[PDB]
Amino acid sequence: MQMPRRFNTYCPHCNEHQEHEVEKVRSGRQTGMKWIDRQRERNSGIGNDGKFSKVPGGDKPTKKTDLKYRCGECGKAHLREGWRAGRLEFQE
Amino acid sequence: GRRIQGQRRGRGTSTFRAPSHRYKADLEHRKVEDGDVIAGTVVDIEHDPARSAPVAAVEFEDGDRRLILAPEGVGVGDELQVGVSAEIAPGNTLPLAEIPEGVPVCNVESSPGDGGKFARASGVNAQLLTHDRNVAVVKLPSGEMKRLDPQCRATIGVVAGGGRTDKPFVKAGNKHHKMKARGTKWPNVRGVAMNAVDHPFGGGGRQHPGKPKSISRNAPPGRKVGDIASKRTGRGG
Amino acid sequence: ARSAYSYIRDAWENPGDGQLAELQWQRQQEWRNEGAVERIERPTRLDKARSQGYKAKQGVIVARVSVRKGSARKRRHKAGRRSKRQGVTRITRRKDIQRVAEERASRTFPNLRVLNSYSVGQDGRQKWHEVILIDPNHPAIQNDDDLSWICADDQADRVFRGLTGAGRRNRGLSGKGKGSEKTRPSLRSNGGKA
Amino acid sequence: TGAGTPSQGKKNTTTHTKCRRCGEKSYHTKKKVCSSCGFGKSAKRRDYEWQSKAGE
RNA sequence: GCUUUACUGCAGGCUGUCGCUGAGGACUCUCACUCCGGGAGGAGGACACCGAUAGCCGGGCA
RNA sequence: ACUCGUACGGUCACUGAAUCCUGCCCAGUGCAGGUAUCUGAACACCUCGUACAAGAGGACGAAGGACCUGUCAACGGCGGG
RNA sequence: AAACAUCUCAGUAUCGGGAGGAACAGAAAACGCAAUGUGAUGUCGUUAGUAACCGCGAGUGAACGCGAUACAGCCCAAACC
Ligand SMILES: [Cl-]
Ligand SMILES: [Cl-]
Ligand SMILES: [Cl-]
Ligand SMILES: [Cl-]
Ligand SMILES: [K+]
Ligand SMILES: [Mg+2]
Ligand SMILES: [Mg+2]
Ligand SMILES: [Mg+2]
Ligand SMILES: [Mg+2]
Ligand SMILES: [Mg+2]
Ligand SMILES: [Mg+2]
Ligand SMILES: [Mg+2]
Ligand SMILES: [Mg+2]
Ligand SMILES: [Mg+2]
Ligand SMILES: [Mg+2]
Ligand SMILES: [Mg+2]
Ligand SMILES: [Mg+2]
Ligand SMILES: [Mg+2]
Ligand SMILES: [Mg+2]
Ligand SMILES: [Mg+2]
Ligand SMILES: [Mg+2]
Ligand SMILES: [Mg+2]
Ligand code: NA
Ligand code: NA
Ligand code: NA
Ligand code: NA
Ligand code: NA
Ligand code: NA
Ligand code: NA
Ligand code: NA
Ligand SMILES: [Sr+2]
Ligand SMILES: [Sr+2]
Ligand SMILES: [Sr+2]
Ligand SMILES: [Sr+2]
Ligand SMILES: [Sr+2]
Ligand SMILES: [Sr+2]
Ligand SMILES: [Sr+2]
Ligand SMILES: [Sr+2]
Ligand SMILES: [Sr+2]
Ligand SMILES: [Sr+2]
Ligand SMILES: [Sr+2]
Ligand SMILES: [Sr+2]
Ligand SMILES: [Sr+2]
Ligand SMILES: [Sr+2]
Ligand SMILES: [Sr+2]
Ligand SMILES: [Sr+2]
């Protein structure tokens, strides 16, 4: 479906309606320094490694929208529930 | 499953050992200080149980009685020489360096003084081709050009008993007797005729390997069976 | 002023440099030709020996022992095991090589008791340690104020029970506080979890 | 030839005999090892914790 | 119990790297080390063996 | 162990005396060889990051794979129109 | 663990070696109720199923301290001779 790149809506920060710019959430890079990362190293040894021997799951036929809503004046973004959309193209 | 026959062999149990207590002697060249002043006289021709070929008992000048790897054409009474200055005739041993190129040789040493390693079986022979001050090129029975230290000793002539392979065993019983004189378990049951538990090819309603026979060089023992790291198979091409 | 001993010590802080380097390169050639346990008239590291209790006296013996380098020489499981207990290659023993050396030396001299030991280097495939052993039955020792303690019955076969300095360390007994909850007073009394 | 009764007739070999060390008829005269006390195998006396219940 | 391109692992083989290991992306040398030789000495040589680790193969085995 | 053995050897497999014979197929799988380029781990090296370290990235790149070739008395195949 | 691989059963069963009448531990490179504080080590009660671990599942699981028992502190290496 089509999605307007910018539009007026509520900004929970300014606490008033303002223009927002919508962007798809880009995955942030990992650091490899979180607790889970250290547990993987500590608990993996000779033989099967329990949960650390499991491999990536599957995929849903369609994913939900994953967007950021940036306020045009205070510059802060907020998140919203997403809705299943086969494709999401922006207009302008 | 269970270990395959090839794995049982390695343990060196009686069934797989050679009847060593019945073997006669290790036909290694004599060790000469130097000079070649060593000569001996063929005192008798005997049967070597471990090679199905004849061997010659020799009495040397200094009183040493030893069996020797005999070439074809050696008989009782004949005198043999072993040294750097030995004469160039059938039955004599000397370093390759002293041998004239183009002369059939046998019981060639791998490393000078080791006693002989190559061309020792019935009717075979290595062919000394090239000389030099650093390397002596010899053509082994398999056709391979071997580079050897000119200081490697060897016996002139071809090994006695040639043609042994020209006659067929004809019957199982004849194979039987020869096998009883070797370190070999015989007869041979085919892999495809065994149960799955006993061999990679075992099992199945009808006999057939349930897999390609060309096995990788990296395969572990127990699995390395069939055609080992074959560069090709068949007769075609 | 500095003791002459301090010079042997300082040399051994960097066994791979200076004259000591050349000595080892020379020595190991001979060591490699000696047996598993060789009694030697004098410690190779005098400073270390005296420091550990050695004395030039009757009843005091020193022996060099060599042991193969690396992990456990273990046989793969011949019966059922869960993946966890199928390892072979990366398994290491719980006793360090110095401890193994101490025991071999002590077995060679059944009447002697291990006093202490120290390292004298290694090559690519083995390690050498020198072990100080004491004769608890010799009067020159029964009368020594610094060593007579090792004559007590309860010191018999001390090495085999981990009572050696290398033994106590290997048992995780170095620390008196944090970390020694499962080591003191013994690995066994703590259910073998240390 | 059955593995039972008929094969029992061939048994006239002497193996286990009275042991010099422990007195039991367990000294295997072919191996020269006592299966009961370990004589011929070890200076120490043959013993095992499984010869009794674990907690006893 | 048996099978395999089932799951997960484990031996084993190949291969790189570090230690053993020295002198002057290709090279010479000798002194460790290896092999041959009764010995003298010869061959090889910082490789190989061995210890450690990494990638690949891996129903041979669990 | 084989082996007091050395290619006229002995190891690993298939077929199963003699006689007359043994066609076509290398795409898949297996084995083997080659390989400009591609891909390909760790240690060392370089950049960022940290007064250090974790970590992120880069350069190099072995076997292996991609790719090419050989091979069926190698696994096997030899149909429908 | 209602399968099962990490985990659990369990450092249990069993095996190798070794001492004693009891063993082992033990005079801080401790503790960290953070203090102007405690003062070798076992052990018992408690701290506590607490902190911590863990397909963060099933399960596993201390310590400092405190109240007790009993109390005990010393010897070398080196410097200088
Ligand atoms: Cl989206
Ligand atoms: Cl034959
Ligand atoms: Cl002792
Ligand atoms: Cl306190
Ligand atoms: K289990
Ligand atoms: Mg011979
Ligand atoms: Mg036989
Ligand atoms: Mg057959
Ligand atoms: Mg059958
Ligand atoms: Mg099988
Ligand atoms: Mg058939
Ligand atoms: Mg068939
Ligand atoms: Mg004093
Ligand atoms: Mg206790
Ligand atoms: Mg040798
Ligand atoms: Mg299985
Ligand atoms: Mg048949
Ligand atoms: Mg269960
Ligand atoms: Mg565990
Ligand atoms: Mg569950
Ligand atoms: Mg537990
Ligand atoms: Mg604490
Ligand atoms: Na851990
Ligand atoms: Na002893
Ligand atoms: Na069954
Ligand atoms: Na094909
Ligand atoms: Na259950
Ligand atoms: Na089950
Ligand atoms: Na777990
Ligand atoms: Na208090
Ligand atoms: Sr761990
Ligand atoms: Sr693992
Ligand atoms: Sr799906
Ligand atoms: Sr020989
Ligand atoms: Sr010889
Ligand atoms: Sr089959
Ligand atoms: Sr053909
Ligand atoms: Sr004893
Ligand atoms: Sr029968
Ligand atoms: Sr009958
Ligand atoms: Sr009988
Ligand atoms: Sr015995
Ligand atoms: Sr016992
Ligand atoms: Sr035929
Ligand atoms: Sr092919
Ligand atoms: Sr006190």
Side-chain angles (χ1 to χ4, degrees), chain C residues 101-158:
Chain C
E102 299 198 326
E103 277 186 41
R104 289 180 181 177
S106 189
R107 285 269 179 47
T108 297
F109 307 91
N111 63 311
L112 308 186
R113 298 175 177 176
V114 184
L115 179 283
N116 229 312
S117 71
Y118 55 84
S119 159
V120 289
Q122 62 177 56
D123 65 354
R125 65 177 195 158
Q126 72 206 293
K127 294 186 180 178
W128 288 279
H129 287 88
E130 270 172 23
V131 181
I132 303 168
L133 302 90
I134 308 300
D135 183 350
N137 301 295
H138 196 298
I141 284 171
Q142 291 167 293
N143 293 311
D144 186 295
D145 288 298
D146 308 307
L147 296 166
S148 80
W149 63 263
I150 206 164
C151 298
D153 295 330
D154 63 24
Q155 287 294 338
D157 292 291
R158 66 204 314 276

Side-chain angles (χ1 to χ4, degrees), chain B residues 116-133:
Chain B
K117 306 288 186 184
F118 311 119
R120 325 220 324 163
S122 287
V124 313
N125 85 76
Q127 189 66 55
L128 175 57
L129 301 175
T130 295
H131 251 53
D132 196 290
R133 295 170 177 168

Side-chain angles (χ1 to χ4, degrees), chain C residues 7 24 29 55 78 98 120 129-130 170 187 189-190:
Chain C
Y7 290 79
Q24 287 301 270
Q29 295 182 48
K55 277 186 172 187
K78 286 193 159 199
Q98 167 170 29
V120 289
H129 287 88
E130 270 172 23
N170 181 58
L187 294 168
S189 79
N190 282 304

Side-chain angles (χ1 to χ4, degrees), chain B residues 21-82:
Chain B
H21 60 286
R22 276 197 255 123
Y23 283 172
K24 287 180 175 172
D26 127 298
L27 322 169
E28 291 181 358
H29 300 309
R30 269 204 44 160
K31 300 158 187 180
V32 181
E33 315 68 274
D34 201 304
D36 143 64
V37 310
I38 290 302
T41 303
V42 182
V43 162
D44 193 33
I45 301 304
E46 312 187 9
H47 171 78
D48 182 350
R51 303 183 308 121
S52 292
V55 143
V58 179
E59 275 197 56
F60 289 86
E61 290 181 49
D62 45 304
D64 284 292
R65 171 57 174 294
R66 312 162 71 277
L67 284 186
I68 211 169
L69 180 46
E72 173 182 316
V74 174
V76 183
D78 299 40
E79 180 182 297
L80 304 174
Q81 298 187 300
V82 187

Side-chain angles (χ1 to χ4, degrees), chain D residues 2-56:
Chain D
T5 307
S7 286
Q8 303 310 113
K10 291 190 174 195
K11 297 177 181 182
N12 62 337
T13 303
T14 285
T15 57
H16 299 282
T17 62
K18 194 152 188 179
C19 177
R20 210 198 306 163
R21 180 206 253 174
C22 75
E24 295 297 306
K25 187 188 131 306
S26 319
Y27 186 69
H28 196 115
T29 206
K30 305 280 197 176
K31 314 176 190 294
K32 301 304 183 190
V33 173
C34 184
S35 62
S36 183
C37 81
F39 184 54
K41 182 197 184 210
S42 73
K44 291 189 164 73
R45 280 291 187 119
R46 182 172 170 285
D47 229 3
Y48 299 101
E49 290 307 282
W50 47 257
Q51 289 175 308
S52 74
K53 286 299 177 184
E56 186 177 58

Side-chain angles (χ1 to χ4, degrees), chain A residues 5-77:
Chain A
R5 175 66 67 184
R6 298 168 179 287
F7 67 90
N8 294 297
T9 190
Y10 190 72
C11 164
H13 305 302
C14 282
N15 209 298
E16 54 189 295
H17 273 54
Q18 266 162 60
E19 186 183 64
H20 285 63
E21 185 213 310
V22 184
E23 168 189 49
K24 291 185 179 185
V25 179
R26 287 175 180 170
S27 301
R29 225 164 184 169
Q30 305 202 194
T31 62
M33 288 176 275
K34 276 57 177 53
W35 173 88
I36 192 65
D37 297 301
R38 301 175 240 139
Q39 186 191 38
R40 175 165 215 203
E41 285 174 44
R42 269 196 306 300
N43 298 3
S44 296
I46 290 163
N48 185 76
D49 305 311
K51 68 180 289 172
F52 301 116
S53 281
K54 302 187 185 182
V55 295
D59 286 308
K60 208 60 177 168
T62 301
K63 314 279 187 180
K64 289 172 183 181
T65 292
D66 178 32
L67 309 168
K68 285 185 184 181
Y69 299 84
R70 284 205 170 290
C71 177
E73 187 173 298
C74 74
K76 299 183 185 173

